[PDB]
Write an enzyme that holds these catalytic residues in place. Structure first.
Site, PDB file in Angstrom:
ATOM      1  CG  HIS A   1      -6.179   1.781  -0.096  1.00  0.00           C
ATOM      2  ND1 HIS A   1      -5.850   1.909   1.186  1.00  0.00           N
ATOM      3  CD2 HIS A   1      -6.759   0.532  -0.260  1.00  0.00           C
ATOM      4  CE1 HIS A   1      -6.201   0.798   1.784  1.00  0.00           C
ATOM      5  NE2 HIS A   1      -6.748  -0.030   0.915  1.00  0.00           N
TER       6      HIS A   1
ATOM      7  CD  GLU B   1     -18.126  -8.310  26.248  1.00  0.00           C
ATOM      8  OE1 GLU B   1     -18.650  -7.844  25.215  1.00  0.00           O
ATOM      9  OE2 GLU B   1     -18.721  -8.427  27.334  1.00  0.00           O
TER      10      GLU B   1
ATOM     11  CG  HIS C   1      -1.710  -1.152   1.404  1.00  0.00           C
ATOM     12  ND1 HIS C   1      -1.284  -2.311   1.867  1.00  0.00           N
ATOM     13  CD2 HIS C   1      -3.008  -1.276   1.027  1.00  0.00           C
ATOM     14  CE1 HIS C   1      -2.279  -3.153   1.766  1.00  0.00           C
ATOM     15  NE2 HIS C   1      -3.307  -2.523   1.262  1.00  0.00           N
TER      16      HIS C   1
ATOM     17  CG  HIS D   1     -26.393 -15.333  28.215  1.00  0.00           C
ATOM     18  ND1 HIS D   1     -27.369 -14.856  27.437  1.00  0.00           N
ATOM     19  CD2 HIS D   1     -25.870 -14.303  28.944  1.00  0.00           C
ATOM     20  CE1 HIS D   1     -27.457 -13.579  27.659  1.00  0.00           C
ATOM     21  NE2 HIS D   1     -26.554 -13.259  28.565  1.00  0.00           N
TER      22      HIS D   1
HETATM   23  C1  LIG Z   1     -10.708  -5.649  10.631  1.00  0.00           C
HETATM   24  C2  LIG Z   1     -10.296  -5.481   9.232  1.00  0.00           C
HETATM   25  N1  LIG Z   1     -11.250  -5.578   8.295  1.00  0.00           N
HETATM   26  C3  LIG Z   1     -10.943  -5.435   6.987  1.00  0.00           C
HETATM   27  C4  LIG Z   1     -12.011  -5.737   6.010  1.00  0.00           C
HETATM   28  C5  LIG Z   1      -9.673  -5.157   6.592  1.00  0.00           C
HETATM   29  C6  LIG Z   1      -9.303  -5.043   5.127  1.00  0.00           C
HETATM   30  N2  LIG Z   1      -8.832  -3.647   4.835  1.00  0.00           N
HETATM   31  C7  LIG Z   1      -7.541  -3.332   4.648  1.00  0.00           C
HETATM   32  S1  LIG Z   1      -7.321  -1.683   4.322  1.00  0.00           S
HETATM   33  C8  LIG Z   1      -9.001  -1.440   4.623  1.00  0.00           C
HETATM   34  C9  LIG Z   1      -9.601  -0.068   4.597  1.00  0.00           C
HETATM   35  C10 LIG Z   1      -8.573   1.028   4.406  1.00  0.00           C
HETATM   36  O1  LIG Z   1      -9.192   2.297   4.651  1.00  0.00           O
HETATM   37  P1  LIG Z   1      -8.355   3.367   5.402  1.00  0.00           P
HETATM   38  O2  LIG Z   1      -8.169   3.104   6.843  1.00  0.00           O
HETATM   39  O3  LIG Z   1      -9.046   4.668   5.121  1.00  0.00           O
HETATM   40  O4  LIG Z   1      -6.908   3.504   4.731  1.00  0.00           O
HETATM   41  P2  LIG Z   1      -6.299   4.429   3.603  1.00  0.00           P
HETATM   42  O5  LIG Z   1      -6.848   5.768   3.990  1.00  0.00           O
HETATM   43  O6  LIG Z   1      -6.951   3.869   2.426  1.00  0.00           O
HETATM   44  O7  LIG Z   1      -4.848   4.305   3.612  1.00  0.00           O
HETATM   45  C11 LIG Z   1      -9.660  -2.629   4.601  1.00  0.00           C
HETATM   46  C12 LIG Z   1     -11.132  -2.810   4.524  1.00  0.00           C
HETATM   47  C13 LIG Z   1      -8.698  -5.155   7.619  1.00  0.00           C
HETATM   48  N3  LIG Z   1      -7.427  -5.036   7.366  1.00  0.00           N
HETATM   49  N4  LIG Z   1      -9.032  -5.414   8.915  1.00  0.00           N
HETATM   50  C1  LIG Z   2     -22.301  -8.953  24.883  1.00  0.00           C
HETATM   51  C2  LIG Z   2     -22.759  -9.094  26.258  1.00  0.00           C
HETATM   52  N1  LIG Z   2     -21.813  -9.063  27.204  1.00  0.00           N
HETATM   53  C3  LIG Z   2     -22.139  -9.229  28.509  1.00  0.00           C
HETATM   54  C4  LIG Z   2     -21.007  -9.270  29.505  1.00  0.00           C
HETATM   55  C5  LIG Z   2     -23.427  -9.458  28.877  1.00  0.00           C
HETATM   56  C6  LIG Z   2     -23.761  -9.712  30.333  1.00  0.00           C
HETATM   57  N2  LIG Z   2     -24.746  -8.696  30.800  1.00  0.00           N
HETATM   58  C7  LIG Z   2     -26.072  -8.913  30.846  1.00  0.00           C
HETATM   59  S1  LIG Z   2     -26.908  -7.561  31.390  1.00  0.00           S
HETATM   60  C8  LIG Z   2     -25.422  -6.693  31.531  1.00  0.00           C
HETATM   61  C9  LIG Z   2     -25.393  -5.305  32.067  1.00  0.00           C
HETATM   62  C10 LIG Z   2     -26.441  -4.598  31.346  1.00  0.00           C
HETATM   63  O1  LIG Z   2     -26.525  -3.310  31.938  1.00  0.00           O
HETATM   64  P1  LIG Z   2     -27.685  -2.429  31.325  1.00  0.00           P
HETATM   65  O2  LIG Z   2     -27.888  -2.592  29.858  1.00  0.00           O
HETATM   66  O3  LIG Z   2     -27.399  -1.024  31.755  1.00  0.00           O
HETATM   67  O4  LIG Z   2     -29.079  -2.824  32.091  1.00  0.00           O
HETATM   68  P2  LIG Z   2     -30.104  -2.191  33.126  1.00  0.00           P
HETATM   69  O5  LIG Z   2     -30.161  -0.745  32.767  1.00  0.00           O
HETATM   70  O6  LIG Z   2     -29.488  -2.257  34.430  1.00  0.00           O
HETATM   71  O7  LIG Z   2     -31.296  -3.005  32.982  1.00  0.00           O
HETATM   72  C11 LIG Z   2     -24.359  -7.522  31.296  1.00  0.00           C
HETATM   73  C12 LIG Z   2     -22.902  -7.214  31.518  1.00  0.00           C
HETATM   74  C13 LIG Z   2     -24.369  -9.640  27.798  1.00  0.00           C
HETATM   75  N3  LIG Z   2     -25.618 -10.004  27.962  1.00  0.00           N
HETATM   76  N4  LIG Z   2     -24.005  -9.420  26.513  1.00  0.00           N
END
Ligand SMILES: Cc1nc(C)c(C[n+]2csc(CCOP(=O)(O)OP(=O)([O-])O)c2C)c(N)n1
Ligand SMILES: Cc1nc(C)c(C[n+]2csc(CCOP(=O)(O)OP(=O)([O-])O)c2C)c(N)n1
Ligand SMILES: [Ca+2]
Ligand SMILES: [Ca+2]
Lengths: 678, 678
Positions: free
Chosen positions: A261, A416, A28, A479
């Site tokens: 690019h 996460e 690139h 879950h």
């Molecule tokens: C998580 C992820 N998804 C995808 C699918 C890609 C593939 N990839 C490489 S470059 C890019 C996008 C490049 O855009 P940019 O960040 O604007 O970079 P630039 O400005 O073109 O140098 C994509 C989609 C990746 N490397 N990692």
């Molecule tokens: C992706 C993801 N990660 C996690 C780890 C959870 C676990 N979980 C369930 S409810 C919650 C907290 C949700 O808080 P909230 O959306 O504010 O809910 P509320 O307002 O107290 O009802 C978590 C951590 C999940 N269900 N999904």
């Protein structure tokens, strides 16, 4: 103040990157050709020592947009890191030191990038890690950590949920030494950002709590860039985004096209570019002496002088502060405290049954006081994962009044993937940092992009994955992990422990915490499990061991986690009908396959049917068993004991199947599954 | 305008939710109590027919914070859907209609939510599909399509970057009918929001391009809530986010504490709640007749008329516009066009070597204009996944000048997990939508949260995962997949197609598209494979078939994708020194497993060594092969030939391992890996 040699340095960087790509005939060129002015003004101003890429107080730089590698490879060569023109002349070729996206391993390449969203999330880890080292050790007169973290990110990095999760976290935490320069080039692969990326980045990063600065002409304005980075370093309690507008392909006859690019500039287009920049259209990999000389006075030689001052300062620190000196000196040597394992717990078949999750909690209580380098937390489940130590202090900004930067309990919120990749940054910082983070095993799969990178790079982060099975019960199948371990057991270089009792949790903590290159996932139970007559740290440390032997068994049952327990119980049943079952607990396939074959084959032998018991997907068990009892369908929302009985995981249910496998194979000879032909 | 009965219905919902939780003695009670006003008011202005839950133009509700399901089951029951107090009384118990998180599979439950950030991203898909349906069939005097998509979300959803990734694309697409109410209750699991979330959501949302409305007293302002949903309905050009403020666990003695978040409330506290709301503390699951009457009146009988007028209109429409009325009714009966499958390309060995990436692009071109329900696209890799058909118009706001909502090619940006839940949502909409999204095989892993729920619910999304192996070449280990297919092969219910040639690609698509309930992933190559003599659509459609066969083979070589032509050449070398190989091509483990075992054991029998060839993890292959040749370590940056070679995957390198598998087994009697003992 930028003279004509600052403008000659920037032409040599852009052309050397351009030549690197076009030689490999792959790569690139656009982002390296556009960010070169910024990479010059920043590195020229970065406190580093290229003769020692590991100084703990080095200003760190992460190229989050890893496809722009020819820019890092060129910067690294010109500023006197260990990389040569032949290394660059072997870019993207097999067995070179210059792979198509930067790998952690190499010198002055701080983490490995190429997945989008990963580098900027890693730099948040690095700045947290710095905030803490500085709060812990810096005494008045002895400011031993104060480095900055400079990141280069692109449009792909801002589009990805992870940089957003990370940026929300860096913002809350007030991470003032974290400078992010956004190559605002208005292009990505498909085309223009107006086609899909058109939100107000600045207003979004300001909502997070970041200071946003701007550089209107990032293609030519060295002056501007310098003043932005400078004012950016005044941001003491705000991370800064510098929205620097550039042109993709700057100099190339097709600059601003989406075509520059990700493919090499066509021959003639590199010739016009060499001419326009004052270089020869017929010559390649040319670096003016003036550039080598400039970076020698500007970077190499003052960094060395700084390193060397830092060393005298650290020795008077050691003289003054003899035990803090000692502790930091060890972390920097990369040693875990002399004989720390002596504070890991051990239980007997006599002690109470506790869920492996509470046993994880108890280890963390006994090693935090032993290991100042252990910083970790949870992604919103501190109660559920049993993941904090009672005497903790949260990692938080001092103004919050609910923690300070020396805290070691990080509260990641429900984030996460970001937790995953920040952990890699804390780890990639140095000073023996031992990071961990807790979540529910099923949602570690949300982090999969970062977890693969801990494995590819070799970063020893520890995932404390609770709620490992149908034992979760009434939360149901959204879950209940079915495929999670199988998946992670196909990933090279990661340890997926699954401790069955007290002693199997302490061995799982000691090998993870002793690891210097493998990440770890410790899957832990919701439910109470008993202590086994036979477990021991010492045996479980081998990754698989005979828990209960018989002389001359009819079947060997290999089980992991809660199933070990069920299996011992199924083995009393079979015993009563005169079937002799040997029970083998396999806490970790990784560690276990690291054993010598003769040891492994003494556990899992020839001529015995081997049947495995594990409440998750049977598909990874073919490398150890002949027949497997497991769940290959999704779970159910009911009281957990009813879910296990519903699925058949009962002493007699296992036993019945052990009988059916003996019957199935009576009269055949059986090769161990471990044995292979090539 | 709300009255004493509207204040009595809100109380009845609050207490039924509380009772469904305490009976289960498992559950999150607080968001039900907190949100009951908002639920009452939103559900009252909804065009829905509780009698016909599949009515295509029903206003759609999505509870993105799935854990608040007790409010959803209370609403669905009270408004007249199929759910009785009995199903409510077996909430969270093994086998009930009331699981602990909603599942798509139920009447009135639109999507399976529970994993955070999944429902809002899903609702963006449901709004995109609505917008396309209306732009395609709505003709003047016949508004067949015009529904709202309503979503409830909480802080945790907002912290998941998938929901940021989705709110950005929605902001871009100006999806005016998507209205989202957010429970600004100021509690999540680890205590207060500020502990780790204090970014300005509103300012962040305005940056995406959303209208933000605020409701200061969510606890009791029925009028203000109703105001914000009327107000929100006006903005056709902006999605709307209503930020409403509630006291989590309102009415409880411990309202506002994180304690009421995930635990049933204390009895003494449920008695005082009931008393406080004018209900009898000593009675459970009471639904006062006036509430039933009220909902019959204000939601069911209207809903049944809107639905009915809608059908009269749709028959005038099929009088008026024959073709378009027949196509919509066909899509509405879930039938694909008759003999659509005939337009698929067939090839022969005389045809050219093509990467199966190009071949895929061609199937997409040949069937697009046969299948008006196929809508799909890439994640900013349109050129890499070749994911277009060229006579396409992009799905955009009319005001872009780039397209309009009748476009069927979507440009997701570099947003893989949101593409994952948007395709799920488009699919969940109805009208036989056939989404497909493309990215690199390797980064489907960013979308795993979404991909598991496609399988758990059974929404038939197609991923066109290009660039499947070390054949990706020079980009090296960060882009070359090693563990991915083994992960998806361990997940229940998904077809992971890795086709070897033109005919095997047509086979993948035929199966993927006819599927009503199982997602799919087609792993495509970079490099050019040739046209296998012996393939056919028909054989390839069974999952695994015998490509070449020999009377009395010394070995069976099982192989997928690029490795099947290699294995055919390995067989050509083995024959030359007289070892007979039968070569079995296995393009999908799922479909093959779904075959009648008599067919399966005829493909892989007893008494032959079977060795499998695939340039990926070996860990999955225990269920078909006696020995597996594969890669269980990360890849390499180099030109792809040089990388295959390095790894050992050359004709001769394969012949050689077969020779060694024959010698290793020569003399043992062998069993097919397929024969299971229990
Ligand atoms: C998580 C992820 N998804 C995808 C699918 C890609 C593939 N990839 C490489 S470059 C890019 C996008 C490049 O855009 P940019 O960040 O604007 O970079 P630039 O400005 O073109 O140098 C994509 C989609 C990746 N490397 N990692
Ligand atoms: C992706 C993801 N990660 C996690 C780890 C959870 C676990 N979980 C369930 S409810 C919650 C907290 C949700 O808080 P909230 O959306 O504010 O809910 P509320 O307002 O107290 O009802 C978590 C951590 C999940 N269900 N999904
Ligand atoms: Ca860009
Ligand atoms: Ca909340």
């Amino acid at each position: 103040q930028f003279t004509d040699i600052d403008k000659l340095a920037v032409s040599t960087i852009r052309i050397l990157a351009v030549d690197t790509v076009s030689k490999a005939n792959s790569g690139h060129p656009g982002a390296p050709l556009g960010m070169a002015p910024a990479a010059h003004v920043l590195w020229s101003q970065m406190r580093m020592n290229p003769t020692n890429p590991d100084w703990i107080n080095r200003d760190r730089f992460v190229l989050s947009n890893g496809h722009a590698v020819a820019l890092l490879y060129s910067m690294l060569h010109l500023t006197g890191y260990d990389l040569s023109i032949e290394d660059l002349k072997q870019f993207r070729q097999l067995g070179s030191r210059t792979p198509g996206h930067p790998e952690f391993e190499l010198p002055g390449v701080e983490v490995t990038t190429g997945p989008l969203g990963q580098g900027i999330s890693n730099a948040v880890g690095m700045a947290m890690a710095q905030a803490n080292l500085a709060a812990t050790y810096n005494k008045p007169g002895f400011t031993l950590s104060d480095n900055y973290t400079y990141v280069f990110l692109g449009d792909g990095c801002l589009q990805e949920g992870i940089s957003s999760e990370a940026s929300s976290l860096a913002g809350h935490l007030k991470l003032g030494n974290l400078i992010a320069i956004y190559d605002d080039n208005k292009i990505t692969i498909d085309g223009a950002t107006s086609i899909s990326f058109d939100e107000d980045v600045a207003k979004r990063y300001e909502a997070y709590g970041w200071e946003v600065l701007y550089v209107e002409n990032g293609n030519e304005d060295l002056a501007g860039i310098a003043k932005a980075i400078a004012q950016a370093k005044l941001s003491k309690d705000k991370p800064t985004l510098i929205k620097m507008t550039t042109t993709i392909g700057y100099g190339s006859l097709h600059a601003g096209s989406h075509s520059v690019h990700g493919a090499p500039l066509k021959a003639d287009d590199v010739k016009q570019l060499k001419s326009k920049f004052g270089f020869n259209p017929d010559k390649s990999f040319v670096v003016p002496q003036e550039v080598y000389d400039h970076y020698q006075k500007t970077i190499l030689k003052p960094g060395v002088e700084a390193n060397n001052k830092w060393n005298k300062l650290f020795s008077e620190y050691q003289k003054k502060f003899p035990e803090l000196g000692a502790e930091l000196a060890r972390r920097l040597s990369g040693q875990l405290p002399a004989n720390w394992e002596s504070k890991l717990p051990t239980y007997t078949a006599k002690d109470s049954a506790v869920a492996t999750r509470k046993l994880s909690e108890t280890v963390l209580e006994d090693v935090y006081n032993q290991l100042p380098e252990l910083i970790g937390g949870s992604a919103d489940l501190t109660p559920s994962n049993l993941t904090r130590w009672k005497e903790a202090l949260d990692f938080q900004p001092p103004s919050s009044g609910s923690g300070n930067y020396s805290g070691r309990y990080i509260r990641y919120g429900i984030r996460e993937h970001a937790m995953g990749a920040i952990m890699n940054g804390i780890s990639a910082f140095g000073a023996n940092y031992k990071p961990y983070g807790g979540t529910f095993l099923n949602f570690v799969s949300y982090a999969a992009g970062a977890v693969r990178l801990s494995a590819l790079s070799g970063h020893p982060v520890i995932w404390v994955a609770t709620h490992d099975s149908i034992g979760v019960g009434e939360d149901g199948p959204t879950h209940q992990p079915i495929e999670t371990l199988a998946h992670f057991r196909s990933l090279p270089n990661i340890q997926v422990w699954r401790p069955a009792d007290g002693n199997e949790v302490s061995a799982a903590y000691k090998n993870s915490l002793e690891s210097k290159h493998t990440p770890s996932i410790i899957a832990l139970s919701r439910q109470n499990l008993p202590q086994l007559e036979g477990s021991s740290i010492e045996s479980a440390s081998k990754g698989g061991y005979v828990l209960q032997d018989v002389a001359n068994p009819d079947i060997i049952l290999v089980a992991t986690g809660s199933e070990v327990s069920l299996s011992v119980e199924a083995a009393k049943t079979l015993a009563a009908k005169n079937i002799k079952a040997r029970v083998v607990s396999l806490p970790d396939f990784f560690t276990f396959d690291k054993q010598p074959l003769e040891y492994r084959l003494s556990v899992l032998p020839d001529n015995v049917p081997i049947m495995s018991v594990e409440v998750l997907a049977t598909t990874c068990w073919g490398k150890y068993a002949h027949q497997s009892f497991g769940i290959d369908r999704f779970g159910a929302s009911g009281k957990a004991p009813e879910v296990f009985k519903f699925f058949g995981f009962t002493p007699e249910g296992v036993a019945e199947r052990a009988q059916k496998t003996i019957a199935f194979y009576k009269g055949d000879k059986l090769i161990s599954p471990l044995k292979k032909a090539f």
